[PDB]
Amino acid sequence: RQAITRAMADQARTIRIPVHMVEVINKLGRIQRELLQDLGREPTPEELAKEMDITPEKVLEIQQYAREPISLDQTIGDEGDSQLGDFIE
């Protein structure tokens, strides 16, 4: 399990993140899902921050680090003839 989780930390994002940031982000994810089931709504930034003993400033930074790149080859129009790359100034 330790090898497989190490691998899932290293080789699973297009922009690699070190392991410890992956651990903090997964803690954030667990706390968000469980606090969703409990609060009934998705909790707030300050709420999760107070919950993980970190700053509500830092929580947004972690959330920004945890955004995966959207592909540049998903045909944007329903009539599929324009890659998404054809619309970035």
Partner: protein, 1111 residues
């Protein structure tokens, strides 16, 4: 009549239709309250049988319960779905982007078998969307419309394509269920059977029957007459049940050691275990009705049965013997026949309730395989249903349905009619349904069972003809998803009033009359012979003894839009189709006049559009304004209807509602009390009433163009408001935080004069292309300056101002007042997406006049961009100096077969000037069967000729001959319906009388300003170095292959090289050419294109040595 606030629109209809047009949004609202289980549905079901009414959610849970682990020692079960009230009212949802929803509570229950307990809770199941009063879902503030869908109902289907190469009829069969595995029982070219099961390419039936628990002797017995059966059973070359079971297996899946005993379950687990194979309740009903098996008992246990398989095969063989009827053992004999996969008796209609139930099912399945997953990983005697149930897959499934699904569309609301007609839409394409290309030319056709159900006229004229229909006026969806239809059951030639909703199948069994049949005032027919619609759609004369069902009324075969086309039965289906598709595109004018001539539908289908505030309970107006009406009911309680004033539609059109009553008036319940966008006094009004001639004037109205009087522009007779929603946000960047404020980098004070003290513009300030709608600045960091820039900064002594300037400048070619600003703030605690602090939207409006290029078009398909806006004086005027408003062309009339425009024109002139049939000596002959109170009609008096029962041509001539004069002794229109127009430009009269009349013309939503576009140097794509694409940005028009062919055929080489090198891709070519133009030098010689270099590196990346060679 029958609607209290009605304007008295006299009507030419000769018939008295028994049934009134239904609740036009029932197809949406009843479906959804089905899925809820509202008490309204609860009672409506009981009102017509419905042994066990079960809400959609109830059905999903009753097919999910129980949830049992592999051990079966512990059980989870659901029940009792209940909705609390919505969390946000409609308007506030639409405002704050809250998706109008409501929570689900589901009383779960966990039971352990080994010890015996219950863990019963009230689980929260997730915010569930909720249909508004208009049958439209609001989503993220937007207003969406789940579209009804057509599919082939899962059942047993039968066809025989003749193999002329053999000259034998090849019957076949497909038992296609809602979900599971197919199976065909063919009859091969050779006199055998083909039993491809679950797409495994080959089987004789005897193999399956033996695997099914039959012996060869048993099969011989059960198949007595069965010639080909006994033949294949002689060549079946496999004996013993286990013997094949292994055949089946082995080929069931290739590459697996069979357990001959154990794979038995696999069979009894593809077709019978009711968890992986379930032709739904529709499927079971359909099969039991086709084979007449379970004729008189309720339907359930959707999985197949050995009786079902054997009955299918026997019926197949009798079909490939030549038969009339098969009598299954224990079942009523049913007619032996092949099926049509287009006929509406087999092409069901998954309404919105069905769609939402499918998504909830596909969510609950994932939830099931997390319940039973963690059902064991958790510790027993410790779990609670709250810990077992995970709702996240359910909520994700729903939310990804309503958003991002090609049946969950933006409500196409650019007028009440389009709002009404997007609902009531049947779209054969979609998930589950057949796609576009994969759909051949067959289904696009109009099978003769579409009559009275799916209007054959209305459909998108693009590349979706047939794949998108709208429902008939009177149709109604069968609880199974079929499209029932009303009829008047007639007995003995005695037309009753027992309105029967015949479905799509049982219509065939009967013989169906016509609504315009000469009833003898009592239900007795008049003539002996009557038209009738026989089974396959063939037409005949039967004497009045067989006719047992007559149409409820004419125009039953026509949709909601097409019912609003006057004189529809004169126009050809091409132009009537184009008219019904351009009648959903008028834009709500500022003045909204009602039309001189119409049908009946302009009122009923205008209060059913939703966009007309309707008096809820009969009362008296207490106080009005342009914003609210306060009706004092009869007993105490009051109510204040809040007008929507200038709400942006989903396509940029205004949505005013001004009230149309006074402070002392008395309104009845169900009355119109506030016009909508295109309503005038309640009824539809999609355009104006414009005096029109039919002469070709000076070539300007050449080939579908139009010339206009300038009176339209002066008096604002055609003038649409438009309201565009501009939006920018302040994000949190790595370098710093974006900031919205007047503080801007190098910039005048004039261009920052209109902004307030805090960025955003002032409500009311006129803008133009290039103004600062929201001054918004972001940090930039540092870049090594250009030393020339540093010298200039020195000489002027200006700072760096490392904040970069990204403000919300109004895009190109837009102007007009700024109606209102809606500003959000993370600081003010309003929720926004992450990495966002301040979301500001700047509603802008502009009052587009009419103008040449715009696309006016009548109600009869006759369209055409405005050609020229003549001044008012040089417009061919009548003898009273009255100019003509527009001037259509004649050469567009005949060859399009839309003389509906001409008949409307004449009848409109009659409706305008007012007539007075001289009943001095009795009544004239043409008006013998005109309705009364049409002998005299006031000037400017509206009329209405309903669609297939309207003014006959004789009635038109008869009216037109007496068309009482205007102010002098002046009958401006001679009996033929024409006049001696005086030329306005030259001065002489025209040598021949020209037709004039009042033709009701709309203003289609293809305005010029929404189309014009130009680019000289704009943005550029990131990945490829080409200009960007589409009017959203600047972009430039495509230069495809066909244009390359054309410009080569001319032999123009240099222009082609230009267009492909230094206008698209030559990266250093672009700046060089721009420099060359600006300085006045010679345009340099273009370099190698960019796409070539990219293609070259891709090829070299594929390990393909590509190498230019000089010499």
């Amino acid at each position: 009549n029958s609607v209290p606030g009605a304007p008295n629109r006299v009507s030419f209809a000769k018939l008295r239709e028994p049934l009134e047009v239904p609740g036009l949004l029932d197809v949406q609202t009843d479906s959804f309250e089905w899925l809820i289980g509202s008490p309204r549905w609860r009672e409506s079901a009981a009102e017509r049988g419905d042994v066990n009414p079960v809400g959609g959610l109830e059905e999903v849970l009753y097919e999910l319960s129980p949830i049992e682990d592999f051990s079966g020692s512990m059980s989870l079960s659901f029940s009792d779905p209940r909705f609390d009230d919505v969390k946000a009212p409609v308007d506030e949802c639409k405002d704050k982007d809250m998706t109008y929803a409501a929570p689900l509570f589901v009383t779960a229950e966990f039971i352990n078998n080994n010890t015996g307990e219950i863990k019963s809770q009230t689980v929260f199941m997730g915010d569930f969307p909720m249909m508004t009063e208009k049958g439209t879902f609001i989503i993220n503030g937007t207003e969406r419309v789940v579209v009804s869908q057509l599919v082939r109902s899962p059942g047993v289907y039968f066809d025989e394509t003749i193999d002329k190469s053999t000259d034998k009829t090849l019957h076949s069969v497909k038992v296609i269920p809602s979900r599971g595995a197919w199976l065909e029982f063919d009859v091969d070219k050779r006199d055998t059977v083909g039993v491809r099961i679950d797409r495994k390419r080959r089987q004789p039936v005897t193999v399956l029957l033996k695997a099914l628990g039959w012996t060869s002797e048993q099969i011989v017995e059960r198949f007595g007459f069965s010639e080909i059966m006994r033949s294949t059973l002689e060549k079946d070359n496999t004996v013993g049940t286990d013997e094949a079971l292994l055949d089946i297996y082995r080929k069931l899946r290739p590459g697996e050691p069979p357990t001959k005993e154990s794979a038995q379950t696999l069979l009894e687990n593809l077709f019978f275990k009711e968890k992986r194979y379930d032709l739904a309740r529709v499927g079971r009903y359909k099969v039991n009705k086709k084979l007449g098996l379970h004729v008189g008992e309720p339907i359930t246990s959707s999985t197949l049965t050995e009786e079902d398989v054997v009955a299918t095969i026997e019926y197949l063989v009798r079909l490939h013997e030549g038969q009339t009827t098969m009598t299954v053992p224990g079942g009523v004999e049913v007619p032996v026949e092949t099926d049509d996969i287009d006929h509406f008796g087999n092409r069901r209609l998954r309404t919105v309730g069905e769609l939402i139930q499918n998504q909830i099912r596909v969510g609950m399945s994932r939830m099931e395989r997390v319940v039973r997953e963690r059902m064991t990983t958790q510790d027993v005697e410790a779990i609670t249903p709250q810990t077992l149930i995970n709702i996240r897959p359910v909520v994700a499934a729903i939310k990804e349905f309503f958003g991002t699904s090609q049946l969950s569309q933006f409500m196409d609301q650019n007028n009440p009619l389009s709002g009404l007609t997007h609902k009531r839409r049947l779209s054969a394409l979609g998930p589950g349904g057949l796609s576009r290309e994969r759909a051949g030319l067959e289904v696009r056709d109009v099978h003769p069972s579409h009559y009275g159900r799916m209007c054959p006229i209305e459909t998108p004229e693009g590349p979706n003809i047939g794949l998108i229909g709208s429902l008939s006026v009177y149709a109604r969806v069968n609880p199974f998803g079929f499209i029932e239809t009303p009829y008047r059951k007639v007995v003995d030639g005695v037309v009753s009033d027992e309105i029967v909703y015949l479905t799509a199948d049982e219509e065939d069994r009967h013989v169906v009359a016509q609504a315009n049949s000469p009833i003898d005032a009592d239900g007795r027919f008049v003539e002996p012979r009557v038209l009738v619609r026989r089974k396959a759609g063939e037409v005949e004369y039967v004497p009045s003894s067989e006719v047992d069902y007559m149409d409820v009324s004419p125009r039953q075969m026509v949709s909601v839009a097409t019912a609003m086309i006057p004189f529809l039965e004169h126009d050809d289906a091409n132009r009537a189709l184009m008219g019904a598709n351009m009648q959903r595109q008028a834009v709500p004018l500022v003045r909204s006049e009602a039309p001189l001539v119409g049908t009946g539908m302009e009122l009923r289908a205008a209060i059913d559009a939703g966009d007309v505030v309707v008096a809820e309970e009969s009362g008296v107006i207490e106080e009005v304004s342009a914003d609210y009406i306060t009706v004092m009911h009869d007993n105490g309680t009051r109510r204040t209807y809040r007008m929507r004033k200038f709400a942006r539609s989903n396509h940029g059109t205004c949505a005013n509602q001004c009230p149309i009553v006074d402070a002392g008036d008395r309104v009845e319940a169900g009355q119109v009390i506030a016009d909508g966008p295109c309503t005038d006094d309640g009824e539809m009004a999609l355009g104006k009433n414009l005096l029109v001639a039919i002469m070709p004037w000076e070539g300007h109205n050449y080939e579908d163009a139009i010339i206009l009087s300038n009176r339209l522009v002066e008096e604002d007779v055609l003038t649409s408001i438009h309201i565009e929603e501009h939006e920018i946000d302040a994000r949190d960047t790595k370098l710093g935080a974006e900031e919205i404020t007047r503080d801007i980098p190098n910039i005048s004070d004039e261009v920052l004069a209109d902004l307030d003290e805090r960025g955003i513009v002032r409500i009311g300030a006129e803008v133009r292309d290039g103004d600062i709608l929201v001054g918004k600045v972001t940090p930039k960091g540092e870049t090594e300056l250009t030393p020339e820039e540093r010298l200039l900064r020195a000489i002027f002594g200006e700072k760096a101002r490392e904040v970069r300037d990204t403000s919300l400048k109004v895009p190109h070619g837009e102007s007009g007042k700024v109606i209102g600003i809606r500003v959000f703030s993370r600081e003010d605690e309003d929720e926004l997406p992450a990495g966002v602090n301040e979301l500001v939207r700047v509603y802008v409006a502009q009052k587009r006049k009419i103008s040449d290029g715009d696309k006016l078009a009548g109600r009869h398909g006759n369209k055409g961009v405005i050609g020229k806006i003549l001044p008012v004086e040089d417009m061919p005027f009548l003898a009273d100096g009255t100019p003509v408003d527009i001037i259509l062309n004649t050469h567009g009339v005949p060859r399009r077969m839309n003389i509906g425009q001409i008949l409307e024109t004449h009848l409109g002139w009659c409706a305008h000037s007012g007539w007075k049939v001289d009943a001095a000596k009795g009544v004239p002959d043409w008006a013998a069967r005109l309705p009364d109170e049409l002998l005299e009609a006031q000037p400017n008096a509206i009329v209405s000729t309903p669609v297939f029962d309207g003014a006959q041509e004789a009635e038109l001539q008869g009216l037109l001959s007496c068309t009482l004069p205007n102010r002098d002794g002046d009958v401006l229109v001679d009996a033929d319906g024409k006049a001696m127009l005086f030329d306005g430009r030259s001065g002489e009269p025209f040598p021949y009388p020209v037709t004039v009349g009042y033709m009701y013309i709309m203003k289609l939503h293809h305005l010029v300003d929404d189309k014009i576009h130009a680019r000289s140097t704009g943005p550029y794509s990131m990945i490829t170095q080409q200009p960007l694409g589409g009017k959203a940005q600047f972009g430039g028009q495509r230069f495809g292959e066909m244009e390359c062919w054309a410009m080569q055929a001319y032999g123009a080489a240099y222009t082609l090289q230009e267009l492909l090198t230094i206008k698209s891709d030559d990266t250093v070519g672009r700046v060089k050419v721009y420099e060359a133009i600006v300085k006045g030098e010679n345009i340099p010689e273009p370099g190698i294109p960019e796409s070539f270099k990219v293609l070259l590196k891709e090829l070299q990346s594929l390990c393909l040595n590509v190498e230019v060679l000089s010499s």
